[PDB]
């Protein structure tokens, strides 16, 4: 569906062109491998990385900036919890989240309009299903 | 060119095969001192797969042997820095392994191209 596809399209370009382009951000492009960091999942409850966000976008998980940002926010919060607040990992994670937020403000009004249209479409489907 | 097709083939080994080794991502780009501060103290002749791709894009490699020297240096470097028994060195060894296998699946083509890159050098010298 048209508006949801357009909305996912934009989120995906934010991930690929901006978030993944943060210098030295490579370790956040991949899930942490529990064989090599055996305590990571003792500490981190809800893992996330940039390749998983891309997979979620391709399946239209996100109908709104808010559910996209809940997964982006985990990138920072997990790094703080596992790698520590003054770790170079965490400095890189903050940059990843900062570019995402700054990019999304450039597209504010258009993403507001696409969210409204996704919701109007959805509503039309439900009342229409009766 | 023999060189354009040769470089194409090497780049596809790096991206398709060597970068596909599981958990090989730490070898895909140069180490940053900000993450590994003693790394360039220990490793005086650094190498990574992105660097090999830039080398290929500049046609630095005229033969498999010059290409393999850089590939092998990735393993020689992991040996010194991470240690001979390190998990990272087992991956580096696997990257080295899949490079050698893929070169074989392309032997005849690469030989043709490698011969023709010389023919050009001698045409140059004969004309010089």
């Amino acid at each position: 569906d048209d508006d949801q596809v357009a909305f996912s399209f934009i989120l995906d370009n934010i991930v690929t062109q901006k978030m993944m382009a943060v210098p030295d951000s490579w370790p956040f492009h991949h899930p942490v491998n529990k064989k090599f960091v055996p305590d990571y999942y003792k500490v981190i409850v809800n893992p996330m990385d940039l390749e998983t966000i891309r997979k979620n976008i391709s399946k239209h998980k996100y109908q709104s900036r808010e559910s996209f940002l809940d997964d982006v926010n985990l990138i920072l919060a997990n790094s703080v919890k596992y790698n520590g607040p003054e770790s170079q990992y965490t400095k890189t994670a903050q940059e990843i989240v900062n570019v995402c937020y700054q990019t999304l403000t450039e597209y504010d009004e258009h993403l507001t309009q696409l969210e409204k249209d996704i919701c109007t479409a959805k509503e039309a489907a439900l009342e229409e299903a009766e | 060119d023999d060189q354009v097709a040769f470089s194409f083939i090497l780049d596809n080994i790096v991206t398709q095969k060597m970068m596909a080794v599981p958990d090989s991502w730490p070898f895909h780009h140069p180490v940053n001192k900000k993450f590994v501060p003693d790394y360039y103290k220990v490793i005086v002749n650094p190498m990574d797969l992105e660097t090999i791709r830039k080398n290929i894009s500049k046609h630095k490699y005229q033969s498999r042997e010059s290409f393999l020297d850089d590939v092998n240096l990735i393993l020689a470097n992991s040996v010194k820095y991470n240690g001979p028994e390190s998990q990272y060195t087992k991956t580096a060894q696997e990257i080295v392994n899949v490079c050698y296998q893929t070169l074989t699946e392309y032997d005849e083509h690469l030989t043709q191209l490698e011969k023709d890159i010389c023919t050009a050098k001698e045409a140059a010298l004969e004309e010089a």
Binding site: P27, N33, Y40, V43, N83, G84, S87 | -
Partner: peptide, 11 residues
């Protein structure tokens, strides 16, 4: 913090 992922990301 946990035990740490080391400088290179895989321990």
């Amino acid at each position: 913090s946990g035990r740490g992922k080391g400088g290179k990301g895989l321990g």
